[PDB]
Amino acid sequence: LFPWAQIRLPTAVVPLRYELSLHPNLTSMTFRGSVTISVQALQVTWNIILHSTGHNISRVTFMSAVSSQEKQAEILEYAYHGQIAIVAPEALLAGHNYTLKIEYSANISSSYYGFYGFSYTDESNEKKYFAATQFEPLAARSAFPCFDEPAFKATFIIKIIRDEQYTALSNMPKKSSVVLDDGLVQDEFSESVKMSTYLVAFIVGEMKNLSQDVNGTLVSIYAVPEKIGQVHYALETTVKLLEFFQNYFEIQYPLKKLDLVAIPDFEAGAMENWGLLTFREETLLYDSNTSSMADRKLVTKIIAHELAHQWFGNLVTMKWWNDLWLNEGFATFMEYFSLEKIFKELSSYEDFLDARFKTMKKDSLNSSHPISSSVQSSEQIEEMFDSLSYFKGSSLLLMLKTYLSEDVFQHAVVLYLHNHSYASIQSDDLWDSFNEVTNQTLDVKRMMKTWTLQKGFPLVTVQKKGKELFIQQERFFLNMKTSYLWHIPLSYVTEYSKYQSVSLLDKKSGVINLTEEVLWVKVNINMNGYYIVHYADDDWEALIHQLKINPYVLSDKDRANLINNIFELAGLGKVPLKRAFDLINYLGNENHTAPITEALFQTDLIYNLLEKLGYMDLASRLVTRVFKLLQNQIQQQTWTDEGTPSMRELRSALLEFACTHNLGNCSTTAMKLFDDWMASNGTQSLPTDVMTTVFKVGAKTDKGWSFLLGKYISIGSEAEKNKILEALASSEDVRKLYWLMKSSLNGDNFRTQKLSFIIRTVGRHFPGHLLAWDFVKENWNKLVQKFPLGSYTIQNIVAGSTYLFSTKTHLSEVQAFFENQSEATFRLRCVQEALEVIQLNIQWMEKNLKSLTWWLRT
Ligand SMILES: *[C@@H]1O[C@H](CO)[C@@H](O[C@@H]2O[C@H](CO)[C@@H](O[C@@H]3O[C@H](CO[C@H]4O[C@H](CO)[C@@H](O)[C@H](O[C@H]5O[C@H](CO)[C@@H](O)[C@H](O)[C@@H]5O)[C@@H]4O)[C@@H](O)[C@H](O[C@H]4O[C@H](CO)[C@@H](O)[C@H](O)[C@@H]4O)[C@@H]3O)[C@H](O)[C@H]2NC(C)=O)[C@H](O)[C@H]1NC(C)=O
Ligand SMILES: *[C@@H]1O[C@H](CO)[C@@H](O[C@@H]2O[C@H](CO)[C@@H](O[C@@H]3O[C@H](CO)[C@@H](O)[C@H](O[C@H]4O[C@H](CO)[C@@H](O)[C@H](O)[C@@H]4O)[C@@H]3O)[C@H](O)[C@H]2NC(C)=O)[C@H](O)[C@H]1NC(C)=O
Ligand SMILES: *[C@@H]1O[C@H](CO)[C@@H](O[C@@H]2O[C@H](CO)[C@@H](O[C@@H]3O[C@H](CO)[C@@H](O)[C@H](O)[C@@H]3O)[C@H](O)[C@H]2NC(C)=O)[C@H](O)[C@H]1NC(C)=O
Ligand SMILES: *[C@@H]1O[C@H](CO)[C@@H](O[C@@H]2O[C@H](CO)[C@@H](O[C@@H]3O[C@H](CO)[C@@H](O)[C@H](O)[C@@H]3O)[C@H](O)[C@H]2NC(C)=O)[C@H](O)[C@H]1NC(C)=O
Ligand SMILES: *[C@@H]1O[C@H](CO)[C@@H](O[C@@H]2O[C@H](CO)[C@@H](O[C@@H]3O[C@H](CO)[C@@H](O)[C@H](O)[C@@H]3O)[C@H](O)[C@H]2NC(C)=O)[C@H](O)[C@H]1NC(C)=O
Ligand SMILES: *[C@@H]1O[C@H](CO)[C@@H](O[C@@H]2O[C@H](CO)[C@@H](O)[C@H](O)[C@H]2NC(C)=O)[C@H](O)[C@H]1NC(C)=O
Ligand SMILES: *[C@@H]1O[C@H](CO)[C@@H](O[C@@H]2O[C@H](CO)[C@@H](O)[C@H](O)[C@H]2NC(C)=O)[C@H](O)[C@H]1NC(C)=O
Ligand SMILES: CCOC(=O)C1=C(NC(C)=O)Oc2cc(O)ccc2[C@@H]1c1cccnc1
Ligand SMILES: *[C@@H]1O[C@H](CO)[C@@H](O)[C@H](O)[C@H]1NC(C)=O
Ligand SMILES: *[C@@H]1O[C@H](CO)[C@@H](O)[C@H](O)[C@H]1NC(C)=O
Ligand SMILES: *[C@@H]1O[C@H](CO)[C@@H](O)[C@H](O)[C@H]1NC(C)=O
Ligand SMILES: *[C@@H]1O[C@H](CO)[C@@H](O)[C@H](O)[C@H]1NC(C)=O
Ligand SMILES: *[C@@H]1O[C@H](CO)[C@@H](O)[C@H](O)[C@H]1NC(C)=O
Ligand SMILES: *[C@@H]1O[C@H](CO)[C@@H](O)[C@H](O)[C@H]1NC(C)=O
Ligand SMILES: [Zn+2]
DSSP: OOOOOOOOOOOOOOEEEEEEEEEHHHHSSSEEEEEEEEEEESSOEEEEEEOSSOEEEEEEEEEETTOSSSOOEEEETTTTEEEEEEEEEEETTTOOEEEEEEEEEEEEEEESOOOOOOEESSSSOOEEEEEHHHHHHTTHHHOOOOSSSSSBEEEEEEEEEEOSEEEEEEEEEEEEEEEEETOEEEEEEEESSSSSSGGEEEEEEEEEEEEEEETTTTEEEEEGGGGGGHHHHHHHHHHHHHHHHHHHTTOSSSSSSSEEESSSSSSSOOOSSSSSSEHHHHHHOTTTTTSSSSHHHHHHHHHHHHHHTTTTTEEEEESSSHHHHHHHHHHHHHHHHHHHOOGGGGHHHHHHHHHHHHHHHHHSSSSSSOSSOOSHHHHHHTTOHHHHHHHHHHHHHHHHHHHOHHHHHHHHHHHHHHHHTEEEEEEHHHHHHHHHHHSSSSSSHHHHHHSSSSSOOOOEEEESSEEEEEEEEEEOOOOOOOOOOOOBOOEEEEOOOEEEEOBBBOSSSSEOOOOOOOOOESSSGOSSSEEEEEOOOHHHHHHHHHHHHHGSSSOOOHHHHHHHHHHHHHHHSSSOOOHHHGGGGGGGGGOHHHHHHHHHHHHHHHHHHHHHHHHHHHHHHHHHHHHHHSSSHHTTOOOSOOOTTTTTHHHHHHHHHHHHTOOOTTTHHHHHHHHHHHTTOOOOOOOOEEEEEEHHHHTTTTHHHHHHHHHTOOOOOHHHHHHHHHHHHOOOOOOHHHHHHHHHHHSSSSSSGHHHHHHHHTSSSSGGHHHHHHHOOOTTHHHHHHSSSTHHHHHHHHHHHHTTSSHHHHHHHHHHHHHHTTTHHHHHHHHHHHHHHHHHHHHHHHHHHHHHHHHOOO
């Protein structure tokens, strides 16, 4: 009988110091290692419980400090929790330090999880090799036996045997690299600071570097030698942010080195490893002449995310996986917060607003879950890794920073990162630190627990009867045919004099007292609060009018929030749909990107749901109306890569609109630009902001489609290829659309990683709509082999082939598919939320279809 029968490690023995010596071969994908773990007991036990998986233990030696001699001990295993147990020869007593040394043999991983390894092809067709480490959930126990929980912090000394050609890196700077008589170099790195096991990292690969010292901190970027020229934007950005976060958090970067590694595999780990920040190669390559604005924003945000964890998440770690939404939600917040003070040109607020629009649509579903849950299973650990929970957490932290001051927010974080530095905590302690810096006036820990321990988000109903604005609270329930209260930080803007105040609604009913009689009111300023506002019939119609007469009294964030709200409220039936189109009838006087892109989002969802239902004529009258609303804005656009970054995205949105629907000249301007490019054999430049639009119009011909296929299988840019791939799947030849999906699943010409992108693109248009869902049904077993159930890929594939069905016939068809597979498969959240969105599409027609046949075509 194993001495421990729980998923969490015992709170008895605690690690203090790790010595890890490893000999990785990479050619064999087998490594040998020894670990020396200096532990202390705070309680008395005869058995030491710790983690290890897939290790051939050769010897385990126990030792006390009262001897210089090693003692034998027996070792047991319980692989269901990955736990190993060392029975003790001496009853470990309280306070007393002991030392365990384990020798083992193991394989290098091929699953890109744990100590992984792979092969790649260089500038010549040379098989160069590479190894790296991804442990973020529970894979540190696969490389070496340890206490694999984030609370059990310790210091680490990493020692690895390499071959002279291969550079070896880890978390800490390197101390002793000595040559051995075998012909092999052994590197030893400095002893770590107190860090968690999931953040340890070590990498053995043939790389070069583009380093730069600042303030004793040597920021360095490592990549495969053929790609060092394209890492210059990353280093210039990694330095402006390491300055910013240091002076924001008011703590210095703890370590001496900051290494950023671009791993040369597409299935690589991108974790916030302390010192050794791992990324994918395409995530860090940028060129100021060939890459896009959206290619610039992605690199500028992925560095900021992983840099923010070097304070929040590695210096001060969370104790368990129940609070991973807080660590990753803070960094997702720090992405958009750092890139608005020092990278304000990129207009990153337009990205956070769209990400918060989409987070609210999938949190509104009844299949959503409270972010704070109980994690007592390993599947529950590996289901805390949801991008929705990370973006809802950033949405709550935005609401906290706006309700409090920006400065009150920082003072809490600086004090929290000082009090709990080099240790582990829980989510309530951050809320406690807010309550200290607010001088115990308001309770943030109660205010947040209404959002963390609860599902969904509120619907705040508003009715201004004079100078009294009546506010009411409800859950955004979508079934439109228990929950509790939220401490909702309210905000409003009224008006020729402008007002701006902040309140707090802690009841189901409330009234805010206005200082004047006003003509229009807008609640949730810039949608900084995680709620939807339903105004009354008169109150909505005031805002619809003030958008006709000077819409720019509100911000672009606020005008986008109204378009999003009135269209989502109309789908539930709370608003007639003719009121949402009255609201967007102001768009002839709109010049900002964020209200136009969201209005084009809502109309495209209506177009595509109506197109799959067969009401093609009504769908064209919808897009020929938004075109007439946006006709001057579209015709004023230039087919270039010039302007502000926000204006460089309105061009890509409006030209993709006019070309997909063949409205105006767009298609003949793109086809001329395509034909010149096709006839330059791909050597002519296309402006990046019109590149995908040009590729799609040309891919509608057998000639131009076959040219693009040869450019994908040859050319080097895995960003220009993914605009080619989208265009190839925008064909209307069903035979081509089936051949693309068949090829990716079998790994011919395209990679199996890109299959989620192909099925999503084939199924969103009419010629491949039924073809995509049929491919998912008839290749399901092979899909669940190549992507396990509950993966993000299997969720994206199911949603991307199903979210446009709007008939009860289709709802029964999709239900009867998954029921006649497994009860397990029928209870996955991918298939329950999918059958839920078909019902909301079924009812969207029941509440808005026959009315649309009236005002359109009249
Ligand atoms: C704006 O201006 C308005 C009007 O002045 C303010 O609204 C009033 O706030 C006060 C302070 O909280 C409220 O007094 C409390 O009333 C409750 C219950 O009393 C009942 O009284 C009425 C019947 O006689 C009825 O109209 C009330 O209805 C309100 O509440 C219900 C349910 O909560 C809700 O459904 C309604 O929509 C109304 O909102 C209510 O049923 C009483 O329990 C309170 O006593 C507790 O709290 C006080 C401190 O708050 C404490 O001293 C006590 O010891 C006890 O713990 C308190 O008497 C009043 O009811 C509100 N009136 C209305 C019409 O809303 C508003 O606060 C102003 N806002 C701002 C930002 O200034
Ligand atoms: C999208 O369109 C809107 C609507 O046109 C537009 O808002 C306008 O911006 C301009 C530029 O800031 C505003 O003009 C200024 O208003 C301020 C008052 O806030 C004045 O101080 C300014 O006066 C100076 O400049 C004048 C000439 O430009 C001089 O005559 C004067 O003596 C001053 O030197 C200037 O009038 C304008 O008021 C707004 N209009 C509205 C309705 O908001 C917005 O900028 C556009 N956005 C983009 C990205 O194009
Ligand atoms: C892993 O184990 C393999 C053997 O299983 C070791 O392979 C060796 O790889 C090195 C790479 O530097 C080879 O050395 C080279 O030898 C050639 C002469 O053949 C010389 O021209 C080069 O300059 C270089 O010195 C070596 O031949 C090869 N040994 C074999 C194939 O038996 C490898 O060293 C091990 N790696 C580690 C980290 O232990
Ligand atoms: C430094 O961090 C410690 C945590 O290690 C902070 O201690 C915490 O302080 C808050 C503030 O009062 C305590 O919250 C209260 O707890 C009681 C029960 O303990 C509860 O009844 C109240 O409703 C409230 O939630 C919290 O318990 C406490 N935790 C511990 C473990 O002591 C401390 O405040 C921080 N100090 C500084 C200067 O940063
Ligand atoms: C038009 O584009 C096509 C690509 O679809 C070109 O064919 C390819 O051109 C590349 C170079 O641009 C060839 O690579 C070369 O290979 C030779 C060995 O054959 C090597 O010595 C060179 O250093 C270079 O690496 C590639 O072989 C070739 N063929 C294919 C099937 O991809 C074509 O050349 C372009 N036409 C013109 C007129 O440039
Ligand atoms: C490294 O990979 C080898 C691949 O053969 C593993 O060997 C197999 O392991 C399983 C499970 O332990 C056995 O049931 C098979 O009988 C083994 N097959 C062969 C051909 O040896 C090996 O287990 C892996 N390394 C470790 C440490 O588990
Ligand atoms: C790559 O790394 C090397 C090693 O640190 C860098 O070379 C050092 O550069 C510093 C300045 O950053 C000099 O003070 C040292 O004299 C150099 N030492 C050695 C051993 O080379 C190098 O600059 C980095 N960057 C590039 C582009 O090669
Ligand atoms: C960035 C990609 O890194 C990885 O490969 C893994 C990571 N990494 C991070 C940051 O999440 O963890 C999870 C967590 C999950 O819930 C599900 C899958 C994974 C995979 C995994 C697991 C088993 C085999 N192959 C891959
Ligand atoms: C580990 O590998 C060695 C190598 O041959 C083998 O002799 C041994 O039986 C394995 N297991 C143990 C427990 O040492
Ligand atoms: C265990 O090691 C720590 C680190 O030096 C030390 O402070 C502590 O006193 C040691 N325990 C005993 C019983 O000496
Ligand atoms: C340089 O680093 C040291 C490290 O302690 C720090 O004290 C000093 O303030 C830094 N200088 C800066 C950030 O300009
Ligand atoms: C919401 O989901 C739960 C989970 O099974 C279910 O029990 C409940 O009936 C659902 N609510 C509605 C209104 O369908
Ligand atoms: C909290 O109290 C301290 C007392 O010195 C004061 O300096 C600070 O301004 C107060 N904070 C707030 C938000 O009132
Ligand atoms: C389209 O091209 C023709 C070519 O003469 C031109 O007359 C017309 O104005 C163009 N329309 C737009 C919207 O660019
Ligand atoms: Zn992260």
